[PDB]
Each structure stands twice: as C-alpha cells, then as structure tokens.
Amino acid sequence: TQNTIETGVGYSTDVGPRVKATWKKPWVNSYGHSLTTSTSISAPEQTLDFSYKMPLLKNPLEQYYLVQGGFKRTDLNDTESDSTTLVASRYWDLSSGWQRAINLRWSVDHFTQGEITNTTMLFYPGVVISRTRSRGGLMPTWGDSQRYSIDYSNTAWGSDVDFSVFQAQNVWIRTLYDRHRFVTRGTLGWIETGDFDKVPPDLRFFAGGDRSIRGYKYKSIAPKYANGDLKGASKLITGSLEYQYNVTGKWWGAVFVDSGEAVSDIRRSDFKTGTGVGVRWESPVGPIKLDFAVPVADKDEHGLQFYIGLGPEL
C-alpha cells in the first residue's frame, strides 16, 4: 500500500501521558525515494520531524542519502527550548548488519537553562556506526543493539561553538532455558567543550528516567548552578540489569536495577541508583510493560515512579 500510520502511546508518573505517531510514505516516485513524517507529544517535550530517503542507483538497498528535518519544543525541569534541526546524511548499510553514516547537521536553538539564556546556531559533521539484531519476534528471545557516534563542531566553518561529542550505547537480550530472559543496558556520553554554556540543553547530558535510571525523574540528575537550577553535565554513564521470568503463558514478571551518573568532573562521581519490579505481557500488538521503581539509598529522593507503555526494549 502507499501510506502507513504507526502509533504508540505511553504513561509515566514523571512525564505523564505520551503519544507518538508516524506517517510513512514508502514510495513517492519511481526513483525509489520515500518519506516519513513523525510526531511525539508529552507535557514536557513536543517534536515534529520529517525524513526523506533517496536510494542510490549503484547498490540501492545498501546505500542511500537521508534528509531529516525537525522542530522541537521543551519544557522540562529548568530547561526551556525552541529547536530546529536539518540533517544531510550518507548511509552505508551492510547485510553484515552494520549501518555506517556520515552526518552534516544544522541547528538553531533558543533556550533557557536555569538563568542562562542563549541562541546557538550549530553546523557540524559526524559519524555513526550502529547495528540492531534480534531473533524470536517482537519480544526477542535474543538480540542486541549498539550505536556509537562522534560529532565535531568547529568555529572555522561557521559553527558557534567548538565541541566534541562521543556517544556509546549497548542493549543486550539473552534467554536461558526459554524462561529466564535477561535485558542488559549500557550508555556512555562525553562532550568536550570550553563553552558549555552556549551548548543547547539537547546536547548536554542529564540522567534519570525510563531507560536511564528508573525511579528518578526524567532528566533530573546533573550538575547545578550556584542558584540550584539544573545546569546539565558534560559526562554521562548509565546502566541497567533486568531479569525476567516467564510466569505463565505470555506473562512475565521482571526485577531490575538501574544506576548511573551525570557529572561534569568525572573525578567527582555522584552515582544515583534505582530499583523495582514489573510485568511484561506479549500482547498481540507487541510487548506491553509495566514498571514500579523507587530510588535506592537516597536522602532527598523517595517516592514510587511507575511506567506503562509499548516498549521497543532494544
């Protein structure tokens, strides 16, 4: 067919309801080209992207250009942002599973972080290497994803700020005796810059929240200003261990521990840890999850955080 509407929904105690919706148009001409429009909506973040794919005649499934553009509005913690991005990319897929991409990103960001207000126009190249593999379906019995990236902004060719961003993340799924499923998750982040105040909050690191540190409020962990407002971190390390047990039928019970930090001086570790129990049901439409988590050994943070939605899990 010609148009497709995918549509997810979510809820969590920190963020509230959350709806995504994508509108894919798989062919637009006999030149292969395709278009995806996406939009996400929650109280704190709202997004609207477009993504235009153009296959190359020589090896059309392996190689393609991408043109993505987006708007984003953020109202979260001590962050307030208007964002507009454009990306030209060159992708090399392999049957070997690895996607390799060169990026050329443009953005204008109007933001307030705490009491600092700025307007940053960025223009930078970058590289991505990624691979997601799974086997056993929509709630895979086995799989892993890895994304590694490097972005390099320099003032020499028009960008507002000199910075280097390095990113890494792993997700690992393994089953043992068809009944004991283990989800393992790892995330590294690092931005080297002499002008952190000019960097948009999107490019700063914050920790906590679902798929970061369950039990802590979404993006609530990071260095503060002298006034106490959230500043954002130049370094992120977060991780999770989850064990899942198939109770009966398509019903699983899960126990998990997340832990991590967002710091600007890696010699000053401030590691926050969260923990909880959950349920997974393999619904006809994909895996539905439900998590309860509390903060662990924390004197300023307490309180149950609870989460529900259609998790991609990888």
CATH number of the domain enclosing 47:
2.40.160.50
Fill in the DSSP letter of residue 176: E
How many CA atoms lie within 13 Å of 158's alpha carbon, on the beta-carbon side? 10
Torsion angle, alpha carbons of 254, 257, 258, 261, to 10: 180
Residue 210's φ and ψ, nearest 5 degrees, are -70, 140
Residues 6 or more apart whose CB falls under 8 angstroms from that of 215 comprise 258, 274, 275, 276, 293, 294, 295, 296, 301, 305
Pairing of strands 116-135, 16-25: unpaired
Cα–Cα distance measured from residue 309 to residue 102, given in angstroms and rounded to the nearest whole number: 33
Cα–Cα distance measured from residue 180 to residue 190, given in angstroms and rounded to the nearest whole number: 34
Cα–Cα distance measured from residue 204 to residue 209, given in angstroms and rounded to the nearest whole number: 16
Cα–Cα distance measured from residue 151 to residue 245, given in angstroms and rounded to the nearest whole number: 40
Closest CA to 53 of 90, 85, 22, 84: 90
Tokens of 133: 């593999």
Residues 111, 113, 115, 120: is their CA dihedral positive or negative?
Answer: negative
**Residue type at 34 in one-letter notation:** S
Contact status, residue 205 vs residue 52, Cβ threshold 8 Å: no
Cα–Cα distance measured from residue 308 to residue 14, given in angstroms and rounded to the nearest whole number: 12
Cα–Cα distance measured from residue 296 to residue 271, given in angstroms and rounded to the nearest whole number: 11
Closest CA to 249 of 291, 279, 293: 279
The resolution of the experimental structure, rounded to one decimal in Å, is 2.9
- Residue 180: CB atoms within 10 A of its CB come to 12
Residues 114, 119, 125, 128: is their CA dihedral positive or negative?
Answer: positive
From which experimental method does this structure derive?
X-ray
What angle (nearest 5°) sits at the alpha carbon of residue 101, between those of residues 97 and 104? 165
Residue written as tokens 């995504």? 20
Closest CA to 75 of 119, 26, 25, 113: 113
Cα–Cα distance measured from residue 129 to residue 169, given in angstroms and rounded to the nearest whole number: 11
How many folded domains does the chain comprise?
1
Residues 94, 97, 99, 100: is their CA dihedral positive or negative?
Answer: negative
Alpha-helical segments (H) within the chain: none
Domain that holds residue 15: 1-314
Tokens of 251: 């019903």
